[PDB]
């Protein structure tokens, strides 16, 4: 299975990690994920239950993404305890599990399984990174109580604990509202967004990569199984897209800027949920993951700590290839055609318009033009006079990754009709 590889390696590796050197556990854990990835490809499109666990179109697509993000972040860091890989491994499993279920209790258990190791991973003991950690834990723990309270009223309105069964008068309406809250917070749909600015700033860069890919994937995965009211969606989107994009102009610390960006993209993605899709989000998130993954690899290559805006400038001198990569990324998140980011937007928007919600879709688009201020605010800054600051160039390892991502990105820009055919929602 996919589950099989993760669980086995995780448990076995747990005790094992004493013997091996920390580099060797990085080697081990890399292998493990990759095997998990292997098993994913070769079993694609055969939906397989074995319990409440149920692999389907959604699962396959998003756990491809979740595993992707996890491979990357584990790459970059050199630790002082084998544990700062071990906990990540766990976290990957947690996100795998989150997508591949539809039963509320699995969903709860999964929510802690993914959230817990994240709190601990917020610590390379940097003083900010404890403040960060705490905020996240308390806000997270608050949402734990909410999502759990949500489930309890849901069981009231319907015999099932699984998601699916008719739905009723008020109580069913009520129950579904509190569930969007929990899930909402994890994907950073406003107005639950509040942690996303502080934690992204506070946490050490590679970790933030992991959050900005994997948690968004995972979160959306489970969100999709919720048959969210068309009113709820409309609220969320408005708040996300307005507050996100406007406030982001004020910021001037690179990671925190990207944090605000990562509210906005959640806002656009949540449009797709209207009629529901798994092809739309499949594609979208593919373009988003790549772009953010690329981008944060680059920020790491700058420095491990809070990156002032200026630090980006001169990236093209330092290395040409890497400098260009980051450019392509930034244009992609703005969605300037023919880049893949445009297609990701377009597909989502198409589901909104089918559903007939007009106003939302207009608002979204207007402020999506706003977004160009800060995106170019990075992307062009690249070419100017070189700064005198800390930098390093990294191995061929990292070069290959980053540049792979950037070619792969624009490749899907021109040929979206490759992937889209087989991001099937049924197999």
């Amino acid at each position: 299975m996919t589950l099989a590889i993760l669980a086995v390696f995780s448990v076995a590796l747990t005790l094992l990690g004493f013997v091996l050197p920390p580099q060797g556990v990085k080697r081990a854990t890399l292998l493990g994920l990759a095997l998990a990835l292997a098993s994913l490809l070769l079993t694609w499109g055969k939906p397989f239950a074995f319990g409440p666990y149920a692999v389907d179109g959604v699962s396959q697509v998003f756990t491809l993404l979740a595993l992707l993000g996890a491979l990357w972040t584990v790459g970059l860091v050199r630790s002082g305890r084998f544990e700062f890989y071990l906990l990540v491994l766990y976290a990957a499993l947690g996100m795998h599990l989150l997508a591949s279920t539809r039963h509320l209790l699995l969903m709860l258990v999964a929510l802690e399984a993914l959230s817990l190791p994240l709190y601990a991973l917020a610590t390379w003991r940097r003083g900010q990174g404890l403040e960060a950690a705490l905020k996240y834990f308390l806000l997270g723990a608050l949402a734990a109580a909410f999502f759990l309270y949500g489930a309890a009223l849901f069981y009231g309105a319907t015999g099932s604990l699984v998601l699916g069964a008719p739905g009723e008068g008020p109580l069913y309406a009520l129950a579904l509202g509190l569930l969007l809250v929990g899930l909402g917070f994890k994907a950073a749909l406003a107005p639950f967004h509040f942690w996303t600015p502080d934690v992204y700033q506070g946490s050490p860069t590679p970790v933030v990569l992991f959050m900005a890919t994997s948690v968004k994937a995972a979160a959306f995965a489970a969100l999709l199984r919720v048959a969210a009211p068309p009113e709820a969606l409309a609220l969320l989107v408005a708040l996300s897209v307005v507050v996100g994009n406007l406030a982001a102009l004020a910021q001037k610390e690179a990671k925190r800027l990207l944090a605000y960006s990562s509210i906005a993209h959640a806002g656009y993605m949540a449009l797709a949920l209207y009629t529901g899709n798994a092809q739309a989000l499949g594609f979208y998130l593919l373009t988003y993951v790549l772009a953010t993954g690329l981008a944060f690899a680059v920020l790491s290559q700058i420095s491990p700590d809070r990156v002032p805006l200026e630090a980006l400038r001169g990236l093209y001198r330092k290395d040409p290839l890497l400098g260009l990569a980051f450019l392509v990324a930034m244009l992609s998140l703005l969605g300037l055609p023919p880049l893949a980011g445009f297609w990701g937007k377009y597909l989502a928007f198409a589901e909104a318009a089918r559903a007939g919600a007009w106003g939302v879709l207009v608002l979204a688009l207007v402020t999506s033009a706003v977004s160009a201020y800060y995106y170019l605010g990075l992307g062009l800054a690249v070419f100017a006079r070189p700064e005198e600051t800390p930098f390093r160039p990294g191995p061929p390892w990292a070069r290959a990754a980053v540049v792979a991502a950037g070619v792969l990105l624009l490749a899907l820009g021109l040929l979206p009709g490759l992937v889209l055919p087989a991001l099937a929602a049924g197999g």
Binding site: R81, L106, V109, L174
Partner: protein, 160 residues
């Protein structure tokens, strides 16, 4: 019912008020222990006996000791340390508390249904077949969570 019922629910709620109002961590936490007893009683009354006993054993016997150990470990002589711009925000907080009950209250006059099924008293005999029956997966999920918790917890506290 409502003769006895009143007593238990009054007690429960009253105890609830105490644990969120009072000063000083120890008195607070201790109130929550009286809470979980009452709640345990209420479980027993609702034909969930097994769950009742676990309520006492885990939540009130394991968990709160851990709480107490933390508030002893690091002291706590004020439930109201410092003074800071948060003062007016006490009434908006108390407002919202009412609100969150209000909307939920509304909802519950919105589906009102029969309370009328059997349960066998909830004895662990009759929970067993389900638990390791088709809930066995959920269970193993639980089991994974605990293990993750242990390892995480260590990595936070001890350097190592």
């Amino acid at each position: 019912m409502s003769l006895l019922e009143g007593l238990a629910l009054f007690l429960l709620l009253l105890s609830g008020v105490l644990v969120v109002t009072l000063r000083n961590a120890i008195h607070a936490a201790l109130a929550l222990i009286l809470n979980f007893l009452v709640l345990a009683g209420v479980y027993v009354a609702l034909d969930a006996r097994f769950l009742g006993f676990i309520q006492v054993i885990v939540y009130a016997g394991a968990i709160v000791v851990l709480f107490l150990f933390v508030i002893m470990l690091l002291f706590a002589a004020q439930g109201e340390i410092g003074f800071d711009p948060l003062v007016r925000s006490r009434p908006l907080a108390a407002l919202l508390a009412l609100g969150v009950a209000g909307i939920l209250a509304a909802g519950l006059w919105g589906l009102d249904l029969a309370f009328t099924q059997d349960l066998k008293g909830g004895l662990p005999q009759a929970l067993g077949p389900l638990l390791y029956g088709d809930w066995l997966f959920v269970l193993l999920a639980v089991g994974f969570l605990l293990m993750a918790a242990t390892v995480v917890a260590v990595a936070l506290v001890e350097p190592g």
